[PDB]
Design an enzyme around this catalytic site. Structure first.
Site, PDB file in Angstrom:
ATOM      1  N   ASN A  51      92.671  51.110  58.815  1.00 28.59           N
ATOM      2  CA  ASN A  51      92.864  52.117  59.848  1.00 28.59           C
ATOM      3  C   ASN A  51      91.563  52.876  60.101  1.00 28.59           C
ATOM      4  OD1 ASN A  51      95.503  52.115  61.024  1.00 28.59           O
ATOM      5  ND2 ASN A  51      96.341  52.745  59.042  1.00 28.59           N
ATOM      6  N   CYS A  97      78.486  56.883  66.481  1.00 28.83           N
ATOM      7  CA  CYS A  97      79.409  55.759  66.547  1.00 28.83           C
ATOM      8  C   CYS A  97      78.802  54.512  65.918  1.00 28.83           C
ATOM      9  CB  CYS A  97      79.813  55.502  67.998  1.00 28.83           C
ATOM     10  SG  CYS A  97      80.301  57.003  68.883  1.00 28.83           S
ATOM     11  N   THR A 120     102.082  55.825  57.508  1.00 24.38           N
ATOM     12  CA  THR A 120     103.424  56.007  58.050  1.00 24.38           C
ATOM     13  C   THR A 120     103.510  55.505  59.484  1.00 24.38           C
ATOM     14  OG1 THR A 120     103.891  57.893  56.609  1.00 24.38           O
ATOM     15  CG2 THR A 120     105.201  57.653  58.612  1.00 24.38           C
ATOM     16  N   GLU A 174      86.151  52.023  53.698  1.00 25.47           N
ATOM     17  CA  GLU A 174      85.444  52.912  52.792  1.00 25.47           C
ATOM     18  C   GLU A 174      85.545  52.405  51.362  1.00 25.47           C
ATOM     19  OE1 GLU A 174      86.865  56.711  52.997  1.00 25.47           O
ATOM     20  OE2 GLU A 174      85.504  57.608  51.505  1.00 25.47           O
ATOM     21  N   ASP A 226     108.316  59.342  51.071  1.00 24.29           N
ATOM     22  CA  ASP A 226     107.305  60.386  51.023  1.00 24.29           C
ATOM     23  C   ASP A 226     107.953  61.765  51.152  1.00 24.29           C
ATOM     24  OD1 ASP A 226     108.033  60.402  53.702  1.00 24.29           O
ATOM     25  OD2 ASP A 226     106.011  60.097  54.476  1.00 24.29           O
TER      26      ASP A 226
HETATM   27 ZN   LIG Z   1      80.576  58.819  70.320  1.00 26.37          ZN
END
Ligand SMILES: [Zn+2]
Lengths: 266, 313, 313, 266
Positions: B247, B261, B28, B220, B51
């Site tokens: 995203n 990270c 969105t 993913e 939605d």
């Molecule tokens: Zn970090």
């Protein structure tokens, strides 16, 4: 279940065969139909299925109950017409039996042979479908090889992984989907071609049988075919005496309708 | 190819931009930022939200409704939330399940004289389309629900079309029959005024030059596979698709501040390598992950800026 | 309830531990660590790998095969990779699609005298089960493939059972008929020796005290929804399930080193709140994210240690 | 398609009705069957469907071709038996017709009335199913309320979100699934109860009709029923003359078999 009532009415007619004790022969049929309706009153099993032609007429604002009564009375008059037809057939049977113990007899045999021949040729048209079964066999090799390719691609895709090699898996899935879509398109094309061929051969059969029928009429329009005493079937005698005051063009459609009905609902 | 969404902005022939994608992806915000970016070039942009959670209301911290309403801070943008869209898109679930070519019209007419729930759907959809076309918006950005696909619905009434053609064919025969045996007009009327707008919007949907689809996913396997299935299903329906936006990307700095990270970066790097290998003919728009404190209009502006030009630290 | 997997270890009545879960989750490492932890209490543990990528080979940096082989560094653990399992589990896809109660036996017999591909599946599965039961392993840990479910396969041959019962009923009638009108034995034989092991393993599967299922997911809507569907489907088949393990958790330190760590932590916190609200009757095992450089036996030992006792920095 | 051949053979028999020019009457039927087989040689359309009873016998090692020939010759003898039955029926028809232009006649009428009554009661057993239709109506209110509950739960689940409130959505989905499973179990229980009731009433009908048949035999075992000259049907006369040198217990099974066949395949 309707053929059950048809068989009961036919056996009743054959029980009343050649019985001249009661002059009111078509009425005898009227009470036959009344008894059938009375028995169907608690035994009114029927199946109504949605069609396409009824959609347009429903969209025309005609009440649904009106359409239902229209169709069911149309059916009812259909089977009562077939039942009156077999009634006239049994009366003819009585006529040549009393003749046994006569150009009408040869005319009856000839029209019977013509109608049975037309009907058997119509029913063996699927046996005449070899001219397109050969094309089916011709396309069978293409279909077999292009489904073997489907199987090979499917097994190769089953071999490859999906997690660490998603690119190849997705590409092979795309290829499999495209080839299966091609298979579906070919199958639908084959079905459409077969349906069109059946339709065109069926309309050709209809036009040729209509030509044969009209030739038979031109041959026997001025010749008496089925001669019965007038007062026996006098309520409907004027209708059945269409050509030259004899049972002609109504008899032909009786024969063809009853034969088509039996060989269709059979 | 190109890591940005500039092909959508420079294509001034677009009139129906859909933003799809299942899962937990914040699509969105991406679509709202796309609409904000479009508002800088067009004369009027509309944001349709199908939605149920009303996410664009929270994105702009405003309250919207079923009518197009001006959003604050912009002069061209308009927003609209239509829960009736999903309410009437749940109903054709049976048609979606069968997806046939002969019997679906039979089912529709059967429910028509049994419950009348489908032609009402057609009227609601036609009314929404008529409002959209009457307000004369340059572009409309749809936020398709994560579950279901109402885009194929426009390909269903073709059975209604040739049924009406058969109706016209039997028109010259019903009238003599009616005279022989002897409301009617309202049904054919409402069909006649609800068909042309449906046909205009359906023809616009199938035109690649005035309808596009942006698929929104994340780095993913599950989301990648869901969007691959979505793209295949969309291409099966002959619907244009050229851009996908990923995203929740991390993009760690060279300072190596956190081990986790780089671990997540390696996982996402594997998934993006798979995506780029699979999607050499698409526009891969990589959108990073924004702060939790950055929420609302600021994040919408940031996403619009990163959509216009690629982000790389 | 409890955030650890100690209920599995302390339940010495377990004999069939399945580890399921779709997506990109590293469930092979979790199941291998579970097997390593089990090896410390039992006398013999077996690790069956039905996945096609042979992940336990990389986890233990060894090469396995279709027979149970000792893994290095352990005295009780054994490992086995059976690609024939997936090869014969792809075949009943038609039975899975129909899942009927009367016609599936008709389809099986039709393919039996047409192609004979299904009774061969039954023989392969019975052979695998016979090997497993003949090596006399205390526990067997299955790594079910991310796609498909071969567990329901054992509930199919009940049609074979009552068909064989009807065969016994007509046994006293076929012989007089055979004498009246006048290989046969091998078919009934191979059925007779392949039925009892199938029945033993199927009865063990439906027993909650000697069969458990661990669902492995990650903190995300897509994986959470997939595992919810998996749990519902598993409960529909009357199969025990009590533990789910969530992977790729961040758990940032209070030093607040990275903004993106807290953003991902907020997302995962929302998803875990949803999970705990939904799964108050389950064991939620939270497994963090390990370094990229930590790969192999070290990560297996770390995951086993964190499975035994909960991890919290 | 088999009924097409049956109708053709029946019309042939009715064409040869009461015809004593040829003594070899059953042979006339033999060439009728030969002509039918010759016509079916290029018109051998049939449908073979997988059953359950054949599975056990296939597992008994009997060759598939042997089983196929067993079943198709069993069918063949079935229709030739029905055709011989209608042949004997037409001969009886000839007999009472020549009688028209006699305890055998009353015996024929009585056995006919008994068999038609049994058959019509068997076919109106579905009309006798009101005793369980009342239980269906009784359970209808439960079914209606517990599907209204399904609809309410489904609409409430459609109202709730799925992303930020997955707990409630999943709980409501679980409740919906459980209630739908309960609905399926109730439907299957209803179907099983109806099937068991039909089976038990059908076996009761079979035993009562068998008792009626055996009572009829005890009544007319020593009484001649259908008297025909021996040399007319002498190839099979000794078989049909089962009781007291007359067409009895074979005639009864002829009547019941032909009536059941017509009212079943109808
Ligand atoms: Zn970090």
């Amino acid at each position: 279940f309707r053929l059950v009532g048809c068989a009961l009415l036919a056996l009743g007619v054959r029980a009343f065969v050649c019985k001249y004790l009661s002059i009111f022969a078509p009425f005898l049929t009227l009470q036959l139909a009344y008894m059938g309706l009375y028995k169907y009153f608690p035994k009114s099993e029927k199946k109504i299925k949605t069609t396409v032609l009824t959609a347009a007429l429903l969209l025309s604002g005609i009440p649904a109950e009106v359409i239902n009564r229209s169709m069911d009375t149309y059916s009812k008059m259909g089977e009562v017409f077939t039942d009156l037809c077999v009634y006239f057939f049994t009366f003819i049977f009585c006529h040549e039996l009393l003749d046994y113990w006569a150009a009408d007899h040869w005319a009856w045999l000839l029209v019977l042979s013509f109608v049975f021949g037309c009907n058997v040729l119509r029913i063996l048209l699927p046996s005449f479908s070899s001219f397109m079964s050969r094309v089916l066999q011709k396309d069978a090799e293409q279909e077999s090889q292009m489904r073997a390719e489907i199987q090979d691609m499917k097994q190769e895709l089953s071999t490859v992984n999906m997690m660490d090699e998603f690119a190849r898996y997705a590409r092979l899935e795309r290829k499999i989907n495209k080839m299966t879509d091609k298979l579906k398109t070919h199958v639908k094309a084959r079905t459409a071609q077969l349906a069109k061929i059946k339709w065109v051969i069926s309309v050709a059969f209809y036009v040729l049988q209509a030509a044969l029928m009209i030739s038979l009429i031109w041959k026997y329009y001025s010749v008496p075919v089925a001669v019965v005493p007038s007062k026996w079937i006098t309520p409907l005698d004027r209708l059945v005496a269409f050509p030259t005051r004899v049972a002609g063009g109504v008899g032909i459609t009786c024969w063809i309708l009853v034969c088509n009905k039996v060989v269709a609902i059979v | 190819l190109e890591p940005t969404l500039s092909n959508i902005i420079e294509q001034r022939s677009l009139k129906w931009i859909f933003v799809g994608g299942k899962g937990g992806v914040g699509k969105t915000t991406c679509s709202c930022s796309l609409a904000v970016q479009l508002s800088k070039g067009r004369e009027s942009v509309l944001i349709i939200s199908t939605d149920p959670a009303h996410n664009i209301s929270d994105a702009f911290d405003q309250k919207f409704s079923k009518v197009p309403t001006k959003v604050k801070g912009y002069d061209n943008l308009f927003a609209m939330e239509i829960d009736p869209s999903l309410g009437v898109a749940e109903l054709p679930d049976e048609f979606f399940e069968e997806d046939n070519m002969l019997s679906m019209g039979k089912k529709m007419m059967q429910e028509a004289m049994s419950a009348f729930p489908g032609i009402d759907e057609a009227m609601s959809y036609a009314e929404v389309m008529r409002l959209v076309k009457g307000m004369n918006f340059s572009v409309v950005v749809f936020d398709t629900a994560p579950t279901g696909h109402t885009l194929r619905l426009l390909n269903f009434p073709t059975i209604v079309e040739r049924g009406l053609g058969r109706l016209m064919q039997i028109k010259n025969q019903i009238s003599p029959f009616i005279s022989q045996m002897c409301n009617a007009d309202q049904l054919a009327s409402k069909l006649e005024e609800t068909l042309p707008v449906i046909r205009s919007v359906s023809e616009q949907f199938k035109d690649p030059e005035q309808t596009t689809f942006i698929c929104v996913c994340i780095a993913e396997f599950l989301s990648l596979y869901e969007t691959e299935r979505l793209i295949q299903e969309l291409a099966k329906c002959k619907i244009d698709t050229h851009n996908i936006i990923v995203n929740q990307l991390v993009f760690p700095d060279p300072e190596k501040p956190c081990k986790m990270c780089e671990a997540r970066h390696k996982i996402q790097a594997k998934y993006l390598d798979q995506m780029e290998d699979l999607y050499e003919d698409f526009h891969i728009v990589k959108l990073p992950l924004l702060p939790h404190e950055v929420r609302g209009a600021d994040k919408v502006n940031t996403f619009s800026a990163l959509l216009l030009e690629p982000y790389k630290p």
